[model samples]
Target: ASAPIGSAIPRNNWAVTCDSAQSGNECNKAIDGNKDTFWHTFYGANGDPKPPHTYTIDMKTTQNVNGLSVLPRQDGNQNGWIGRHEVYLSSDGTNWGSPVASGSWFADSTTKYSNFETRPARYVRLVAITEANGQPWTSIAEINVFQASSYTAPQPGLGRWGPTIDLPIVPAAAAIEPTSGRVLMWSSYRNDAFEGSPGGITLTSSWDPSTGIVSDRTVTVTKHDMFCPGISMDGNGQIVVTGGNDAKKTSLYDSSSDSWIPGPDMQVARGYQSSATMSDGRVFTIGGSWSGGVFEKNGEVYSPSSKTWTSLPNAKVNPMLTADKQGLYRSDNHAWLFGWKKGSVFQAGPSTAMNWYYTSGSGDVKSAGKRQSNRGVAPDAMCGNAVMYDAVKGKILTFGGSPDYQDSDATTNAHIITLGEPGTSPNTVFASNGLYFARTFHTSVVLPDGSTFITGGQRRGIPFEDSTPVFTPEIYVPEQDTFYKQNPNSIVRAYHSISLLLPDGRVFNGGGGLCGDCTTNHFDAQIFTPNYLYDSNGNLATRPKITRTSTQSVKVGGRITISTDSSISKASLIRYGTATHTVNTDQRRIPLTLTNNGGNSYSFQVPSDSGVALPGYWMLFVMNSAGVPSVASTIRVTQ
Candidate 1:
């Protein structure tokens, strides 16, 4: 019930000193309230001082300090912009304790704020550890502090929903760009509807969350509609989208160049398929009888190096077929896939029967037992959702979906699949408590906090029609083995709806019907800010920050060091996500084994087995003791 922090503290009578300063750019300049003037570390006749610069401010009066704002140099020469830094508060100028706020600021001229719990202090110190561009100088245009408001306000219980945003397309499929963080999305040949034609063009767009700008584009060179394709990310970070309107067609998206290229066609022409990036850095796909004729659509593997798709004759879809009344047409569609050790992909379900498909050589399938529920035998979960929320432990959470793809009531059942050793059956157990709402065609995203965020689905399984849309979202915490209700969303994101975790620790939930001129066709999106972003008092909490990472790429069994501005309790990596038709086989979360190296530095060990840590780009997130997570740092995992 805490109110938002109070206005900026007055700068009157404040004195400042620094370890080093250039002639006129003394530390006092930082408190001058002038945007043009700045304080900079010495780089004159004495030459630049190697970083780790210190600037201490004496407010002349003790005050309740909660946060500080830092404006970067506005004169345009970005030389001394601070990258990694720490802020400490002191009752007396002499006995300064640990830093209350720390993290790497963006390499820009925009002002940044460092927030923390309110503490009483008379003096404040800022330690600039490194230059943004690896230079040897530090600079600050303006600095100020603030105190928390004493007034209490109503708590925002389970977090809140952001405003709805209009999009050019329905966004039936979406993926995150690794380096730039922009989201790339596409629908059919049109922006908001499907024309029921195998048109050579597909409407695509990009959303830059940093700027709130959406740009539109068209894909004709690939000659694919890309509507119900199996999307997977390769080791090189290229997005390999297969099947759909152009059934056997393959389209590759290179984010680095922001262009599309044609890939070798798959051996089997299919749609509504599920795909995953294997431990060996190859993409494997299966089960797609929704389009390209109703038949037993078998498995196939795409080799990025060879630019070829190899048919997996032995990896048939028969063993994992669901008990759907529509037979192969509905049964062999959207298998819940997770790539595991030794180029093996684990199929958790839509079907009650589970199996492991080996992608190496000619490829082979090993039948695991049927998924067991509280009733002894679980039902088919077509259009249901599953996520490898804990990759390190090989844990998968499967929930929702109906017995049939259409004309069936959805189930509230949920199960936890704890994978055993390689080439063995995983242990499946029913969740103590299932979802509060029965849902089909729902989307589940693994949050940085390791909780599963579920939203947008229906009580009945019907495509392109919003009948029983579940408005309220829910968060499932694995540790507690419980589900908690969250604020409801305005849109009915059933069927073609999609949801994925953004880099800034929020979930992008959007889209539904893509049928031509359909009232249910939603060409918009909404961002969900989880409860972790809010303090117990319901105010936006100060988040932990990762100041630096030892490396951007690591091999299986390798180790990486990370430096933070404040103490953090946990660290984890969530594979970059992509989704179409409630099927995002590429997304997985793996918690790292943390080792405190002291001095706000921590080291983590990557999962030793290649299968456990699928090769691809991952988003590394660190959470503080208060459960708030930092904006993720993108890392690449190699075999």
Candidate 2:
């Protein structure tokens, strides 16, 4: 004999009441058996109340309930589809104990269900913990308690991906525009191809997230092919790009005027170099034998006032060379640099031995010793990543790279380098749990919440090849000193890719394969909304708001007042990032200590030391008690 069939309980005598309901969309509409009418939480006048919206249904007689069917609003919009939710059963409405079913649902118009073991109950409660898209409202077209024969369904995923954005160029180089909040990107002479020869013109584009607009332009003024160039944003919010296809050329982009102009040429014609902005508002660049010829491409500093490049004769690249198989040709490329006190800069990795480069006078270099491990010295990690996630404490997190630039397996090793004091060497400690995947040519971005976002790399260090790409991303929480896996990305982001933090609390990850009409060229990008955007219940969280600031610019050690609509628990400033070839030397985060002055106002002090908070443009973000951050406010920090 077959199993007994189950049917939906009739709603003839059922009564429904919700915690809060909109004017016309009352609670009774949910159980009214009509898919057109919906019960929506209050979203008028004072705005939608923070979620955890609930609805209770009372059945006149006791009955066996085994499942629930939730029909989302029949309307085309998905404004308030229940995201993270729970279902409860009780003998009396007020006596509902633990939930019978709990899980997340996809943000779609389709009907969803939660089936469990049959139980006797007279009342059922449905809780909408969070809205699907991080909103603060909830809605339901129809809902019912049914006794089902047998049913099974898969739960929704943890994090989600936004639709892909097509771009005109591959965006091998990118920087966040502090003034306009747009992203500036560029490729070589051609939009999608790199013919291997240094061309006269470069293709550049800008994308405005405020309004989905992408504008394209050609860089004929500089007459430089900026492929694989060293880029940094100066203290005055101008972009300084140097040494690529036109090895000795320097190009400056001023966001205020939205125009590009030619700057003084570099002393060393080089490519694959790295640069950092100093505390005193100058730019420092070194290495890059990848293009200009395999030789010592010593360090140099560019003075904005003088508009000239001074060679740092003493700051040689020999002390920091890695033991790669390709000799000086590959060993001295793409160094990891961090600006420190005075005019000094710390060269951390891509090489086992670290050094400190003092940019004062004619420049000087000092040995900081090799990165030591328990077993011995750590291996050289060429094409790796380093981030100054905590500038207040002088803490940097370095991870993921291969022994060679290519043709070698990557390592999952990670280290935390803590600076002792000014002009002193930093201490390197191995991280507790390394990355989930061994990657090379990967990108690491420091989020406003002080967590490092790691994404897009390959198991083997092969440039321009999409083989063995790791799709899953990871997050390193500084407080816990551990790595957690996140949702995977469909596209491959390897060599020539870029990742940057936007002011909207999301990351722009794009580019790769700018190899002359090859299948690997990706002229597109995607926005990654971090899990922090959601509440603990896995729903869109209520974000805090910053009403105003005392000033748009502040000096080091200066105090600034910030006004918010609600109380904030913490605040931070992340330097606007400019990236190329998997390196973003301009990125860093400084946590501010806040003093609550009451009346929705707070005061915080910028770092007293300029080395800790390098002079430049930064995005200030405030976090609420729930750990959700507000949209960033652009602020300039000066000496």
Q: Tell me the whole-model lDDT of each prediction, alpha carbons only.
A: 0.84, 0.83
Q: What is the total number of backbone clashes in candidate 1?
A: 3
For residues 1-639, what per-residue lDDT tens digits would candidate 2 score against the true structure?
Answer: 001114688997998889889888999999888999999888878577978999898887787776677888887978888866777889876787766655455456766655444567889998877777779888889887786543332113335454345455788999998889999999998876667665668888888878655667888898788887899887767899997888888999898888888899999888888999998888999898877777998899998888999999788888889988988878888899988888888988989999998887777888887776565677999978999999988888999999999899999988888875545778888875678999998997999889999999999988878889997888888899889887776567898899999998889888878886465776667677887787766667888999989998999999889999998899999999999988899999999899999998999999988888899899999998878899999989999
Quickly count the clashes in candidate 2.
1
Candidate 1: where are CA atoms >4 Å away?
1-155
Clashes of each: 3, 1
Supply the global lDDT for candidate 2: 0.83
Q: Cα deviation of 529 in candidate 1 (Å)?
A: 0.1
